[PDB]
Design a protein around this ligand. Structure first.
Ligand SMILES: NC(=O)c1cc2cc(Br)c(C(F)(F)F)nc2nc1N
Ligand SMILES: [Zn+2]
Length: 573
DNA sequence: CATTCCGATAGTGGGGTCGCAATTGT
DNA sequence: ACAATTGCGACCC
DNA sequence: CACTATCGGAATG
């Protein structure tokens, strides 16, 4: 019953608050609480007459919980120049543009139920995000209540939370006065603001919001035009950029891009491109989505700001597949709002292309306004003393022979199971967000688990007890029990995540999804010949043979039978 | 047909902010 | 002792 | 978050 449903929710919420007052605790540390507050708002908005004056929603810091988005929040593929846009355009035609500023903030999804704001979440991994409702409620530009006609029963508004330049500078002024923490740039400051435990701190940071999209939608009368939906949003009280434009050709899109580039300094806030999307919702549904991103939109980026620094060293790091990746250690320099000290160098071939020597002066940028990249050596400034970058012929960790197969770029450690670096990075991978998802298990504790020889394969993680853990460096009684707990909860996975977690060569997230959908179960998968494997969409000789060799080797079957015995499971399909 | 091209994925890599709890300090 | 500082890892881009 | 070497399969002559 719904009367029964409300009291049950209200009673546990007031239990939590009473436990909190009585322990004079610094916060309700249980994620249950923010979740139950969400469940109770939903139910109460759904039955507005049954709301009581002293209901917990009518009003204690609480730990952040999570929100699943049935409609994924994905990424945008990038284009960096006019010719790449044209190739985007042709790809669309071959399978009207609404043109928008790409606000530099973070993505937030806000669920209104019957027009009443009920939750807000971050993107997370696309499916599951952080519940940040309490922080979002504080944002002046986001209404608690929609107003107007044909408001849908359920409307999930997607948008960008950002901090304008005057608000960023305001907060840094406050920090400088009161000896507080000074922020590096508006993008990373906006993300931080939204993750405060304490909504009252978020409230003093002048975050604003612009809508760009819809998630779930049930009821209402929205048009089939995306701009049309953005104008409806605005009729309902939601903030929408004054700059959303319709373009009828690729040439008009290019003029929009150049005009926004020219006007960038006058906007009052930061942006990192424009977003170009298929305006028609029915043309968007026909174009669909790749694993990572829609086929009907790109981000068209502006050129990234460059700076000069010099390379102090080049180190070679060992990956889980044995890959040896060079990394430049740079003299720290500021670039577009952040301190850059490192950049990948990809491979031996790239180093040769740059003709990079240790000591060289280099041009550096944040690729796509994010990730350090080395552009080129400045040869005319090369110092009298520089040193040759020698690629490792022996694994810097375990000592084994490095092998590079004829005509391929990547050089590997041949140590396999004896390599500690490989051991460590296979576990970091096993445990990662998109695989087994074990909270708390990062590089340091994995580094010790392996160094101390406590874990040899993944099933060993499930045997660790809190006592075994407490004794480690930077571990203790509470963090030990948190890890045993996380490991317990992570046993319930999915067939795809499990396949992904094993680190079969060439089998990453999308290919694991693929084998899982096709084979249904692990025994089918295990019994496949190289030939039935090649039937799976996007599985070819190379993937077939890795999948086959892997399941063929008893060690690998035992890893799995062991993880199965430690209690790892997923739903029968 | 062999060959080249291209869409998409796998497997690497970066910096900032902040919560929790280990540790240091008082 | 408990209070301040800070290592680590989650999570934003 | 990006780069891009690679894979698998579609386009070319
Ligand atoms: N950062 C931005 O301002 C922005 C981000 C978007 C992300 C996605 Br995913 C989309 C999609 F169209 F795919 F939903 N649109 C967007 N539009 C925008 N203006
Ligand atoms: Zn090695």
């Amino acid at each position: 019953s719904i009367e029964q449903q409300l009291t049950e929710l209200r009673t546990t919420l007031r239990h939590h608050e009473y436990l909190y007052h009585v322990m004079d605790a610094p916060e309700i540390p249980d994620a249950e609480y923010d979740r139950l507050m969400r469940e109770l708002r939903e139910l109460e908005t759904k039955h507005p007459e049954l709301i009581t004056p002293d209901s917990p929603t009518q009003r204690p810091l609480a730990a952040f919980s999570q929100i699943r988005h049935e409609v994924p929040m994905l990424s945008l593929d990038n284009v960096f120049d006019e010719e790449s846009f044209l190739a985007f355009n042709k790809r669309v035609q071959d399978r009207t543009w609404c043109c928008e500023l790409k606000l530099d903030g973070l993505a937030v999804s806000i669920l209104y139920e019957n027009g009443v704001l009920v939750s807000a979440a971050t993107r997370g991994d696309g499916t599951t995000g952080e519940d940040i409702t309490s922080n979002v409620r504080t944002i002046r530009a986001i209404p608690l209540k929609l107003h107007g006609e044909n408001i849908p029963a359920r409307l999930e508004v997607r948008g960008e939370v950002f901090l304008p330049q005057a608000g960023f500078e305001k907060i840094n002024e406050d920090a400088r006065r009161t000896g507080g923490k000074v922020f590096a740039n508006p993008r990373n400051a906006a993300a931080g603001s939204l993750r405060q435990l304490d909504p009252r701190i978020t409230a003093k940071r002048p975050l604003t919001f612009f809508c760009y999209g819809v998630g779930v939608l049930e009821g209402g009368e929205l048009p089939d035009t995306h701009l049309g939906r953005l104008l409806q949003f605005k009729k309902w009280g939601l903030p929408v950029s004054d700059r959303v434009t319709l373009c009828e050709s690729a040439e008009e899109v290019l003029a929009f891009y150049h005009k926004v580039e020219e006007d960038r300094p006058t906007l009052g806030f930061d942006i990192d491109g424009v977003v170009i999307k298929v305006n028609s919702l029915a043309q968007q549904e026909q174009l669909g989505f790749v694993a990572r991103a829609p086929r009907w939109a790109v981000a068209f980026k502006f050129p990234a700001q460059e700076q000069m620094t010099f390379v102090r060293d080049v180190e070679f790091q060992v990956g889980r597949t044995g890959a040896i990746t060079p990394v430049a250690r740079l003299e720290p320099v500021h670039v577009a709002g952040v301190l850059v000290s490192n950049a990948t160098l990809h491979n031996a071939d790239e180093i040769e292309r740059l003709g990079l020597r240790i000591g060289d002066k280099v041009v550096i940028r944040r690729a796509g306004d994010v990730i350090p990249q080395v552009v080129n050596v400045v040869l005319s400034e090369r110092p009298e003393d520089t040193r040759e970058v020698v690629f490792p012929t022996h694994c810097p960790v375990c000592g084994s022979d490095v092998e590079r197969v004829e005509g391929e770029a990547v050089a590997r450690c041949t140590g396999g199971l004896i390599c500690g670096a490989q051991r460590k990075e296979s576990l970091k991978h096993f445990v990662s967000r998109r695989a087994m998802d074990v909270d708390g298990m990062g590089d340091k504790i994995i580094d010790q688990l392996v160094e101390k020889e406590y874990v040899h394969t993944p099933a060993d993680l499930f045997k660790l007890t809190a006592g075994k853990l407490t004794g480690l460096e930077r571990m203790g009684p509470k963090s030990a029990q948190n890890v045993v707990n996380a490991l317990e909860k992570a046993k319930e996975t999915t067939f795809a995540r499990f396949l992904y977690a094993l680190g079969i060569r060439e089998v990453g997230e999308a290919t694991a999804a693929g084998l899982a959908a096709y084979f249904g179960t692990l025994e089918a998968l295990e019994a496949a010949s190289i030939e039935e494997l090649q039937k799976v969409p996007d599985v070819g000789i190379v993937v077939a043979s890795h999948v086959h060799n892997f399941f063929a080797e008893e060690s690998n079957r035992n890893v799995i039978s062991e993880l199965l015995a430690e209690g790892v499971h997923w739903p029968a399909p």
